[PDB]
Amino acid sequence: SGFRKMAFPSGKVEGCMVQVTCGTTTLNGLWLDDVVYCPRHVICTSEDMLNPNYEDLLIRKSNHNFLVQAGNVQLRVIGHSMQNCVLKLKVDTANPKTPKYKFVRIQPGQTFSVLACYNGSPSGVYQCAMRPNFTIKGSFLNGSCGSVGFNIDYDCVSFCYMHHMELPTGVHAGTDLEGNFYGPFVDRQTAQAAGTDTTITVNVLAWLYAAVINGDRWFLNRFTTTLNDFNLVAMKYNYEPLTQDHVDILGPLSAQTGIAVLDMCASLKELLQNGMNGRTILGSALLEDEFTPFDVVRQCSGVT
Amino acid sequence: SGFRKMAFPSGKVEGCMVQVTCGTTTLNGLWLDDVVYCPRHVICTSEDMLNPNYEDLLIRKSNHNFLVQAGNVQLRVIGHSMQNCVLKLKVDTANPKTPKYKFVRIQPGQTFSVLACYNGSPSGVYQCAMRPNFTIKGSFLNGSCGSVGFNIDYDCVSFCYMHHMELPTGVHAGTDLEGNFYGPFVDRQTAQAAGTDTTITVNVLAWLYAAVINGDRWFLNRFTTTLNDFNLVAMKYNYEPLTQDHVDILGPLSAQTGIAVLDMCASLKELLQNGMNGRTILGSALLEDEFTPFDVVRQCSGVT
Numbered sequence: 036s037g038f039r040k041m042a043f044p045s046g047k048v049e050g051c052m053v054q055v056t057c058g059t060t061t062l063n064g065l066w067l068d069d070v071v072y073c074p075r076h077v078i079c080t081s082e083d084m085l086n087p088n089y090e091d092l093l094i095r096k097s098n099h100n101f102l103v104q105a106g107n108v109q110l111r112v113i114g115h116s117m118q119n120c121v122l123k124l125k126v127d128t129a130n131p132k133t134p135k136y137k138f139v140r141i142q143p144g145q146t147f148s149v150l151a152c153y154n155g156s157p158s159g160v161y162q163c164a165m166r167p168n169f170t171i172k173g174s175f176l177n178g179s180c181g182s183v184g185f186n187i188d189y190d191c192v193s194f195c196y197m198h199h200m201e202l203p204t205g206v207h208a209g210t211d212l213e214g215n216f217y218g219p220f221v222d223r224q225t226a227q228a229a230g231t232d233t234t235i236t237v238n239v240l241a242w243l244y245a246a247v248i249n250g251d252r253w254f255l256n257r258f259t260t261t262l263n264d265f266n267l268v269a270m271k272y273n274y275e276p277l278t279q280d281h282v283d284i285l286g287p288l289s290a291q292t293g294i295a296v297l298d299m300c301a302s303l304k305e306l307l308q309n310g311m312n313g314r315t316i317l318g319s320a321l322l323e324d325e326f327t328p329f330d331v332v333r334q335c336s337g338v339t
Numbered sequence: 340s341g342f343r344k345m346a347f348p349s350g351k352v353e354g355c356m357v358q359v360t361c362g363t364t365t366l367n368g369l370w371l372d373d374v375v376y377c378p379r380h381v382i383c384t385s386e387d388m389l390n391p392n393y394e395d396l397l398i399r400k401s402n403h404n405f406l407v408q409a410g411n412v413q414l415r416v417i418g419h420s421m422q423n424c425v426l427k428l429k430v431d432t433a434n435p436k437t438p439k440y441k442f443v444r445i446q447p448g449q450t451f452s453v454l455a456c457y458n459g460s461p462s463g464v465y466q467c468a469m470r471p472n473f474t475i476k477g478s479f480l481n482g483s484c485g486s487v488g489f490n491i492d493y494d495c496v497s498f499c500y501m502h503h504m505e506l507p508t509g510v511h512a513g514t515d516l517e518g519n520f521y522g523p524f525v526d527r528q529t530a531q532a533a534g535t536d537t538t539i540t541v542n543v544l545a546w547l548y549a550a551v552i553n554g555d556r557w558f559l560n561r562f563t564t565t566l567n568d569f570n571l572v573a574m575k576y577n578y579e580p581l582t583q584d585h586v587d588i589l590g591p592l593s594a595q596t597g598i599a600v601l602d603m604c605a606s607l608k609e610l611l612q613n614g615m616n617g618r619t620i621l622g623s624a625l626l627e628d629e630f631t632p633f634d635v636v637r638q639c640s641g642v643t
């Protein structure tokens with residue numbers, strides 16, 4: 036009973052957080068096995084961020100210039116290399132708390148938990164979606180760089196995001212764990228356009244199924260629609276077009292509730308065209324798109 | 340930049356979760372030092388829950404009937420005692436992962452994180468408020484009993500909630516760590532009235548300050564109000580009456596933003612009387628009350 040914006044338990048990730056300092060800049064690093072991963076802008080001063088030449092800035096740094104600390108644990112740096120927008124600092128000690136892990140590049144519309152950190156210390160955990168325009172609407176202040184996003188499947192942490200930057204608009208941008216930015220962003224202090232964003236249609240439908248399962252069903256109607264007709268409405272309301280692949284991933288929710296995906300689409304169509312009429316769905320007065328069909332199945336069945 | 344419903348990092352709590360089995364019932368326990376805490380209804384069968392005589396049911400149980408497990412760790416039970424609605428199982432081994440901790444009884448309107456667990460395994464973490472009627476709107480399924488709520492102040496986990504029951508209405512009830520229920524609830528399968536609930540006024544105002552800090556300011560107006568006038572509006576809209584103690588705890592937010600508390604009350608008054616006019620505040624289309632003034636200060640300053 037009930038449905039919440041739930042994050043993964045952050046324990047396995049807290050054990051990997053370290054503080055990385057280079058010169059006057061301090062940010063967060065991720066210590067997995069004998070490597071510490073952090074945003075490459077740790078080598079910059081505030082002045083360098085206008086148009087940094089990272090290759091040149093990194094050449095002025097030696098292993099002993101990277102100070103890596105995890106509480107009373109001072110790590111000895113024996114190698115450094117830049118891979119895309121991340122620095123990889125080889126340390127002489129493997130992290131005894133390294134969980135089973137993978138590095139994954141998530142798709143837009145997928146969700147993950149963020150463990151927000153400052154000075155290598157965890158401050159909080161929250162669940163979010165990678166927006167269709169490759170930004171995330173997180174909660175990050177100065178010092179949060181290097182905080183990571185992840186998913187967990189039983190004992191395996193799949194790291195998908197490392198925080199790098201706040202855009203002038205207050206939204207966030209970062210990379211996968213190989214240092215490749217999600218979206219068109221560059222690690223420079225320059226105004227950068229984020230694409231037009233859309234609402235994640237498949238996630239809104241998944242959340243409507245979660246609402247029906249938990250008792251909120253006032254939005255169910257006597258109508259149906261087609262993928263074509265629904266997509267004309269989705270275009271009008273800046274929603275992602277629904278594909279048969281999205282219908283297919285909603286199959287378990289459709290099967291559990293007995294509500295055909297196109298019938299749920301007709302409810303979403305009427306909610307888009309008429310609004311919520313001052314009513315709520317799972318404690319929200321807007322259409323929620325930060326729950327994937329898999330999140331709903333996991334939460335509704337109590338997967339640990 | 341940004342503002343999220345953030346939970347505490349759950350690492351310190353994950354290390355305390357165990358599975359407790361007695362007969363055919365299995366639920367979650369909390370292992371701190373050499374004691375395991377769990378809901379006393381672990382000693383009941385589904386049939387017993389109608390009107391259980393816990394004193395009699397517990398008399399039929401011996402230390403060897405409580406199976407306590409944490410993965411490949413099987414704990415040896417050397418004592419058992421009931422304290423209010425919790426069972427305390429003394430084990431022969433202190434939990435090596437016991438964090439610095441306290442047991443606290445939170446006040447209604449305060450917030451905390453819940454680490455939802457099944458079979459002793461963490462499934463997710465979410466932030467919530469203790470409602471003014473002493474219920475929580477969580478996300479709990481069968482097997483989640485024994486999952487706990489907590490707050491963290493630097494290295495100290497203050498445990499405030501242990502999950503026991505879902506009311507016929509889909510809301511949740513539980514106890515403090517001494518087994519005293521929050522609210523009028525009893526651990527019986529009987530329909531139980533939860534009081535009339537109200538919206539937590541001080542938290543809504545704190546969240547309006549968080550919105551101003553993060554750039555959402557369309558709701559600021561040219562008006563002011565008095566505690567008396569505001570409270571007539573709060574009564575009409577089923578909001579908790581605002582006191583000088585609530586005004587006092589909003590002082591840091593008032594000081595940071597330069598918006599007098601009564602001026603923010605006038606914005607809240609106009610939002611209550613006119614609605615949000617199809618607009619959002621921090622990604623919400625309703626007035627959010629699950630952030631205390633302390634949560635806003637902590638999040639807005641990046642406390643770890």
Ligand SMILES: O=C(Nc1cnccc1CO)[C@@H]1CCOc2ccc(Cl)cc21
Nearest residue numbers: 076084175176177199200201222223224
């Ligand atoms: O964005 C930044 N950080 C930041 C991150 N999350 C939240 C708040 C802040 C503090 O501004 C820094 C400072 C600004 O300039 C740039 C430019 C490029 C890159 Cl990669 C990083 C940065």
Ligand SMILES: O=C(Nc1cnccc1CO)[C@@H]1CCOc2ccc(Cl)cc21
Nearest residue numbers: 380388479480481503504505526527528
């Ligand atoms: O409420 C319960 N559990 C539960 C908890 N959270 C979410 C879902 C469920 C499963 O119903 C059990 C089963 C029902 O009867 C009672 C009566 C009293 C008490 Cl203390 C516990 C219970």
